[PDB]
Amino acid sequence: SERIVINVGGTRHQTYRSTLRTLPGTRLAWLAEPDAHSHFDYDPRADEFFFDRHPGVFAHILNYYRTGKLHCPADVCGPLYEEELAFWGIDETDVEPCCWMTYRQHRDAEEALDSRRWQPRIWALFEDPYSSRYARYVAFASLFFILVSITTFCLETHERFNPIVYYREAETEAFLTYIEGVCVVWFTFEFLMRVIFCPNKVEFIKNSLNIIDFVAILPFYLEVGLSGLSSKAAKDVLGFLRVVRFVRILRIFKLTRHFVGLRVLGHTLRASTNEFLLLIIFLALGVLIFATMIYYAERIGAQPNDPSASEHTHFKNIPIGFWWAVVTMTTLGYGDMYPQTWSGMLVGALCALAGVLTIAMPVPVIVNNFGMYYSLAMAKQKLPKKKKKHIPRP
Amino acid sequence: SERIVINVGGTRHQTYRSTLRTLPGTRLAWLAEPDAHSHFDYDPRADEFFFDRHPGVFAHILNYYRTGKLHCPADVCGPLYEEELAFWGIDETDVEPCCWMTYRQHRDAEEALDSRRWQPRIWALFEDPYSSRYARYVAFASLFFILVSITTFCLETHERFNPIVYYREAETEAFLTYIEGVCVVWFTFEFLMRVIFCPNKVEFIKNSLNIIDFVAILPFYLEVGLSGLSSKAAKDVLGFLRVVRFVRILRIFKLTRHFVGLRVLGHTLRASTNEFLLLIIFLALGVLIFATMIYYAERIGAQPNDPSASEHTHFKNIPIGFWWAVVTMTTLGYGDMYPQTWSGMLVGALCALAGVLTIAMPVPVIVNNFGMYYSLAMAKQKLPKKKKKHIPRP
Amino acid sequence: SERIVINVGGTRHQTYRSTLRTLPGTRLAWLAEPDAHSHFDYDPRADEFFFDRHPGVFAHILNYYRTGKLHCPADVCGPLYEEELAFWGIDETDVEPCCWMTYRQHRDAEEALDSRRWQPRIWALFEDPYSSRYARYVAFASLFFILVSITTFCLETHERFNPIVYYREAETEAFLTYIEGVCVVWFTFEFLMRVIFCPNKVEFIKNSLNIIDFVAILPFYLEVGLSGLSSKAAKDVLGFLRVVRFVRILRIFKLTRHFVGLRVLGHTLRASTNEFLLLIIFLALGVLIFATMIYYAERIGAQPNDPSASEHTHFKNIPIGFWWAVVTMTTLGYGDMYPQTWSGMLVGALCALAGVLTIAMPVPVIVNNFGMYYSLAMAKQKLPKKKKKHIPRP
Amino acid sequence: SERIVINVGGTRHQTYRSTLRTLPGTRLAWLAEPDAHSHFDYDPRADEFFFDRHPGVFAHILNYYRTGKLHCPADVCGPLYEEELAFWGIDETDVEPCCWMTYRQHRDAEEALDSRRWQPRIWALFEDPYSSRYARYVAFASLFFILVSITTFCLETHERFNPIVYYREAETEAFLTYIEGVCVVWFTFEFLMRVIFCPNKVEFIKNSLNIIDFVAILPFYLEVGLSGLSSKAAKDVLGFLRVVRFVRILRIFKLTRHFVGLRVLGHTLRASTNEFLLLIIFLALGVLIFATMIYYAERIGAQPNDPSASEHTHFKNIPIGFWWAVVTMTTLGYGDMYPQTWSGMLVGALCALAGVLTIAMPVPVIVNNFGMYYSLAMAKQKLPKKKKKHIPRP
Ligand SMILES: CCCCCCCC/C=C\CCCCCCCC(=O)O[C@@H](COC(=O)CCCCCCCCCCCCCCC)COP(=O)([O-])OCC[N+](C)(C)C
Ligand SMILES: CCCCCCCC/C=C\CCCCCCCC(=O)O[C@@H](COC(=O)CCCCCCCCCCCCCCC)COP(=O)([O-])OCC[N+](C)(C)C
Ligand SMILES: CCCCCCCC/C=C\CCCCCCCC(=O)O[C@@H](COC(=O)CCCCCCCCCCCCCCC)COP(=O)([O-])OCC[N+](C)(C)C
Ligand SMILES: CCCCCCCC/C=C\CCCCCCCC(=O)O[C@@H](COC(=O)CCCCCCCCCCCCCCC)COP(=O)([O-])OCC[N+](C)(C)C
Ligand SMILES: Cc1ncc2[nH]c(=O)n(-c3cnc(Oc4cccc5c4C(C)(C)CO5)c(Cl)c3C)c2n1
Ligand SMILES: Cc1ncc2[nH]c(=O)n(-c3cnc(Oc4cccc5c4C(C)(C)CO5)c(Cl)c3C)c2n1
Ligand SMILES: Cc1ncc2[nH]c(=O)n(-c3cnc(Oc4cccc5c4C(C)(C)CO5)c(Cl)c3C)c2n1
Ligand SMILES: Cc1ncc2[nH]c(=O)n(-c3cnc(Oc4cccc5c4C(C)(C)CO5)c(Cl)c3C)c2n1
Ligand SMILES: [K+]
Ligand SMILES: [K+]
Ligand SMILES: [K+]
Ligand SMILES: [K+]
Ligand SMILES: [Zn+2]
Ligand SMILES: [Zn+2]
Numbered sequence A, B, C, D: 001s002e003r004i005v006i007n008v009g010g011t012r013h014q015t016y017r018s019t020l021r022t023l024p025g026t027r028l029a030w031l032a033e034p035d036a037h038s039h040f041d042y043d044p045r046a047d048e049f050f051f052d053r054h055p056g057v058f059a060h061i062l063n064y065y066r067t068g069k070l071h072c073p074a075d076v077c078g079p080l081y082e083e084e085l086a087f088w089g090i091d092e093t094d095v096e097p098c099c100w101m102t103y104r105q106h107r108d109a110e111e112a113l114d115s116r117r118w119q120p121r122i123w124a125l126f127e128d129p130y131s132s133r134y135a136r137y138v139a140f141a142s143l144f145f146i147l148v149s150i151t152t153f154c155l156e157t158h159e160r161f162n163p164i165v166y167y168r169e170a171e172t173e174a175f176l177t178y179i180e181g182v183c184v185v186w187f188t189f190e191f192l193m194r195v196i197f198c199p200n201k202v203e204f205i206k207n208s209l210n211i212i213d214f215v216a217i218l219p220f221y222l223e224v225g226l227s228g229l230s231s232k233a234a235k236d237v238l239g240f241l242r243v244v245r246f247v248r249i250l251r252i253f254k255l256t257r258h259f260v261g262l263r264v265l266g267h268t269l270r271a272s273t274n275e276f277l278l279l280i281i282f283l284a285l286g287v288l289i290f291a292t293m294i295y296y297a298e299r300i301g302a303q304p305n306d307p308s309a310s311e312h313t314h315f316k317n318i319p320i321g322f323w324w325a326v327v328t329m330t331t332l333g334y335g336d337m338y339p340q341t342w343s344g345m346l347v348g349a350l351c352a353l354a355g356v357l358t359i360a361m362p363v364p365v366i367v368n369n370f371g372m373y374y375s376l377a378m379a380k381q382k383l384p385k386k387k388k389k390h391i392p393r394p
């Protein structure tokens, strides 16, 4: 018997019996066997096996058996087709690459997004801005002191607050130190309170954000407690430890983890490393080629080993041409170094065009990834919540 | 009985009785009840309940009951599916986020776009260019005087019309004052005519565009009536009130409200504030980081507290590096300040690349919003009009 | 009777009789009338009216009657739906704006793209490169002489070919005149041959490309025949007529009309004038606003009418700020004028960001139009030809 | 008889007999013939011819016969429709151009991507990094020596390694020669081993990458063996042969052929030559026009043949204006030459805007091509492998 009619939700699909056996182990293959009447309930009169699934995609599911290739329809959402083919016992790895990228589009993004009686209350005072009426004030104070520290760090590098008076040297003002002292007092209090009243201290140390808070207060204490005699080494060590203050601006990442857009940016960066590598490689190759070409172009009609050749051109060598190539490919154009010869002008035009092309090739991939993640997150926060409202298991 | 066949427009959908009860309160749930024969007319012979709706989307509507997840088909317009699921008594908030953004795509844009016997005629003389044979001429005259005022305001800042003669000072020409006098006469006449013959004076004051028209004529009268003795304070107050003349260029917005593209731009700006905030935050973080990094890079191999370190570099400090970072991230490249050291060159390349990336991330969202709004508005004005031509209520 | 079943290609659509009358005058409305049995052939047994059209779109065509709104399906090409609704006697102007832009997508582009026994042979010698074995050589010669003329015109402006000897003056070389003489001889021969052996001389004059060929040879003859005495006016008229030689570079458009990409560019420009107007308006408003703001920003903390205020800033006035604003909004950055004050720096950052935003808003529309036209043209030339191969009228 | 019902997978399509004959030679045309009962098996009772294909696309396949135009549905993958219409014996060249570009979208990209007992082992030691435990080390050594050679070549052009001592001249250091000697020894060993133990020596010579490896070592041997007497010609030939060392940086392409992104880039370049030609033509026309216009604009109100006119402007001539136009159209803005007159400023603004427009027109085509190729390749490498798992021929 070849007439095996299948009633999927009302539509009476029909095909030959031999076709269903092309994929042994699947539900249709089991159905096609003669000893399947009891396994699947069917009406003997109509002689049709009934199912309660989506009839639209069953056509493609069966066409897999017919032609031997699996495709996902473009008129339905990917997850729906995934659920249907999971019900029908078909692996999703067999989908052809013509329609795999869009099929595996929402799930990958979803997964990427998904990536002592006072201890609880004390730990909940910090680490969560919106969890009580007091955590918000603590977060605001932390933000205020972080911004004050960043501002003071930026001011310390100015010439108005570093007057020259150890013959003359340059001595920084004092109030810039008192402000940082107050900020450091607050930060050390917060750090002690967090570290003492926290579980799994090892995870706390590994958080990679407490290290920043520790190293941002260490230099102040080292400076205050290491300002004694023995200037020969003390002055040098203090001068080279004053560079560690750059870690004060990294505490701002301890505060932006709550902002949604920056989480989306982090996910996008973590999901598009290959594109960054490709961009770097393209830029390196182009920079090398165009530096060499401009170096040779700016010397046509010149004595090879003549000092005069490298006198009327900014490209004294190839290594310095990397800077010019990088500036030209990005359409930046500082103007510190430009060609002064017609062949150099042609090379510069080629460099600018090729730079635009190379830069514009991978960037759209990262942009599309970011757009996907951002739309998904904003839609996810648009919907407040929803109960199952389905009472499954009929 | 489990055989509950549904005839939706001709297609005979079939499913188990238990499935329809998974969503109590919905039309299908009421139908599945035994006491529903009289509620919904059906042929006892065929034993099928008839409906007169779209059969294509009923498959998805029922698959919601089957699998427990709601999706909108991608082969039909969103509004059609919305109407169908409103007929079937299903809330649109249950649609999964995999297909919610496109489903809520046209309606949000449509809503955003949708955002004394002489009093009527006198008020209609103004406030509406295309409403009579005389309003057009009034609008043209207003445009002419507005452009004249803007041109005179721009000229007043030039050195040819501000010769030096109160020892020398700089005295502006007189014709530039006579022109503005004529323009102010016209503007005050128009303002009086509008304010006198208008309803709900409070709304008139709150319009936020009449305030501009008032403040753009106030300084002229203050100047003409405040040019007496007591120079010690009169000269200073006049000099600092001469800055208020910048409000003369804002009257051009009173005239561009009719242009469609600028209304679309206003809607796009009002609908994409989060993207602007995200762009600002990204730029701020990048600027801070790259300013710090360039400041430190331009000093490798230097004495920490040595005046010579900040002698052969444009980056005397971090605050001035914000300007360089902003210029470099935008591919602008004025050239007023550029790195002069290899590490500085690497930092500059990184800054340019990261700036391109960050700028290109959110901007496409705003661009897509603007494109949607513009296409919708231009299509809306392409169609002149159309009667219902449906005679509903069959 | 309400059971009016419609058999469209096999699918048995069913609906109430009253529904079909909602749109009087249409084919379905006529069918629903009791006196329609003879008009449309149907089987009395099945009691179903047969049609031989596409069943898929009939669902939407009937849903128009059901719900009262017309939509075009997104799983089929627009022209197919247009043909179907033309067969069903429904106007295409009733489609809702949610799906009108894509429906009217291919046809508009197609229409835009669609926009004496020796007289025939002589006229066919020119005006068509690929029409014989001799027209190609004539076109190549014309191209050669056009390029020679352009090169000579560009050289005439150089300082090497204009030595100073009417005391000194500057006298151009002679060979640059002999070359142009040869080119002009060829061009006048071609122009005479074209004008003499052509129909509808008025259309020839109106072609707008023969005027260029005439004005590009007129100055040479005027110069050669107007080099006599009376220098007082002859020298001046010759000097101001030497400017007309710029029309020699416009003959290149007489030759690029065959290239497909430039025809596509012309169509895109002719189809996107509103976007250019919008871009111009946006740029003008931004330039004005930012020029005013930078002018005022560069003077904070200054004496209003003090010559010293306009001494340490490039923005002596607002009009010169238009140039800076235009350069900054485009990310060009010549560097001839930049802010030197922190408020000026903030204004410049805002200007650059707003310029990027404004420029990026309408340009994508033009880009999409160009892509559509280019893809359509390249696909049209990919297909060589095809006979009807349908033998219609069955 | 006109009732010819077709049972395609369960759906009972019906149409007139005359319709099927509109396309003679096709399977449906043969079926419609009276002598086709035995050719195609069918049930005499149901009077319906059975098929085992996809019912969804059969509607469009038959609509081709109905209306006379062929379209591909947008709810299925192109290859599926291609297979179906190949089964139904319909040529794919008849598809209208409204839906041809997307139909021929995956296949073109797929095709483009698809574009002495020791001889085998010895040849497999090279030419394949991942084929053994020793080839990887050889590839790493080759990479190390290639990078060393490139670094030495770049250093040779510096002034620190070319001190001045044939009166003074400039003599390069010696260690830079010893390093290159070691690298050349390795490279010549590798080249000999490859050329000796390879088949079809002609293909080896034609590989176009062995020529680079040969010419990159030839100059070293020529220099070492051509440093004798007869300086008059020896010095000149050595100086002009020292330029051939630029071929040392091209060996890096012998190593990047394995990287996937660069193969994708090569395919994209090979598939988008017309777009590059179009970009070049657009840039040339714009450059010419804007150079002429700026040359004329910077001279309004000047004596035609006066030396003073070309004294206060950077545009001494039109040829030098090509450089300015190229720099301005790309938003690069070096600043070496800028307009200094209001008409020049207007021309510059127009040039910048038109340059942005022209550059942005074709580039998106190349970007889309690259995105398609990259996504296809990355998806192809995501899937490790898969057996047929279909056992065809039922
Ligand atoms: C992927 C790659 C992409 C590449 C894209 C780009 C590809 C670019 C491709 C090619 C560009 C080629 C440009 C070559 C320019 C040479 C000019 C020169 O050196 O002149 C000097 C050579 O002479 C001297 O320096 C001193 C005299 C020695 C004898 C010279 C004899 C002639 C040699 C000829 C050797 C030619 C062959 C050289 C080797 C090829 C000076 O010559 P002169 O006669 O002494 O003085 C003339 C003065 N006059 C002009 C005022 C009358
Ligand atoms: C997110 C973050 C991303 C970051 C990305 C980027 C990451 C970048 C990471 C790292 C970059 C590290 C660069 C370090 C360069 C130091 C150079 C220097 O100071 O030399 C001076 C130090 O000496 C003096 O100034 C005076 C003498 C004092 C004693 C010095 C002993 C050596 C100290 C060594 C301390 C090393 C450790 C310093 C602390 C690390 C001069 O030395 P000299 O011997 O007096 O003179 C040499 C002269 N000669 C060269 C001509 C022979
Ligand atoms: C869409 C729109 C977007 C807009 C976005 C941007 C929005 C931006 C919004 C606001 C920005 C506001 C900036 C104001 C800066 C004023 C500075 C100034 O003029 O100082 C001079 C005024 O004095 C003189 O010039 C001479 C003395 C006359 C008496 C002055 C008394 C104080 C007046 C105050 C009037 C204030 C109010 C002015 C009117 C507002 C000098 O003062 P001095 O005391 O003589 O000398 C001080 C010297 N010292 C500093 C070294 C000690
Ligand atoms: C696709 C294309 C896109 C194009 C877009 C752009 C399109 C742009 C379109 C048009 C722009 C047109 C600009 C014209 C400017 C001319 C200025 C000039 O030359 O003045 C000089 C002419 O005179 C001399 O040089 C010496 C005296 C000779 C007699 C002059 C008589 C007047 C001639 C008039 C001939 C006019 C017609 C010229 C031919 C058209 C000096 O004149 P003057 O009187 O000696 O001195 C005045 C001094 N004063 C001002 C201080 C009082
Ligand atoms: C270093 C030097 N010093 C004195 C020189 N004198 C002189 O004439 N040249 C020279 C310069 N470039 C040349 O070719 C060019 C031109 C443009 C780009 C380009 C090339 C390459 C080599 C193919 C690589 O990319 C040639 Cl062939 C020569 C002979 C000189 N080079
Ligand atoms: C202010 C100053 N004054 C004199 C100095 N002398 C000297 O050598 N440095 C110096 C400079 N940059 C350093 O590191 C770099 C390099 C590039 C970027 C970058 C860094 C950080 C600090 C990790 C942050 O981002 C180091 Cl480690 C040092 C020792 C000096 N800094
Ligand atoms: C012409 C002049 N000459 C001497 C001055 N001295 C001085 O202090 N100002 C000044 C400058 N800009 C001011 O405001 C700013 C700042 C930035 C941008 C901006 C504004 C506006 C006016 C709101 C418009 O856009 C103010 Cl309020 C003042 C008082 C002076 N202006
Ligand atoms: C070479 C020269 N030398 C002395 C001159 N003195 C003078 O006045 N001109 C001049 C300059 N440009 C003119 O027109 C312009 C303006 C801007 C752009 C543009 C044009 C064209 C010609 C239509 C082409 O594109 C005119 Cl009409 C004239 C009379 C002079 N030109
Ligand atoms: K740029
Ligand atoms: K730039
Ligand atoms: K620039
Ligand atoms: K610059
Ligand atoms: Zn979905
Ligand atoms: Zn719609």
Ligand SMILES: [Zn+2]
Binding pocket: C076, C077, C078, C079, C080, D071, D072, D096, D098, D099
């Ligand atoms: Zn189509």
Ligand SMILES: [Zn+2]
Binding pocket: A071, A072, A096, A098, A099, D076, D077, D078, D079, D080
């Ligand atoms: Zn497919």
